[PDB]
């Protein structure tokens, strides 16, 4: 890395994608699979449209993503 170029891709340099719930009483951010792109996702995406069953509901709290716990 460490240089001015578009499309940062390298070994161990993995990206991640996140999506915010469409409900204002949610506003929760769920993780997605690295094969998915935010330019092919719906304008009304919600927790019910998640890929991971551990967080596929609006009644499930947001994940601890702060480090390793």
């Amino acid at each position: 890395g460490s240089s001015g170029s578009s499309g940062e891709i390298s070994g161990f340099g993995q990206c991640l994608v996140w999506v915010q719930c469409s409900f204002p009483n949610c506003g929760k951010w769920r993780r997605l699979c690295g094969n998915i792109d935010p330019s092919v996702l719906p304008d009304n995406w919600s927790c019910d449209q998640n890929t991971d069953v551990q967080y596929n509901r609006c009644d499930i709290p947001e994940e601890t993503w702060t480090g390793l716990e």
């Binding site: 991640l16 994608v17 996140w18 999506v19 915010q20 935010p38 719906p42 995406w45 480090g67």
Partner: peptide, 10 residues
């Protein structure tokens, strides 16, 4: 629906 990206870091 808002979207973002982050680095896999701590």
């Amino acid at each position: 629906a808002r979207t973002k990206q982050t680095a896999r870091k701590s």
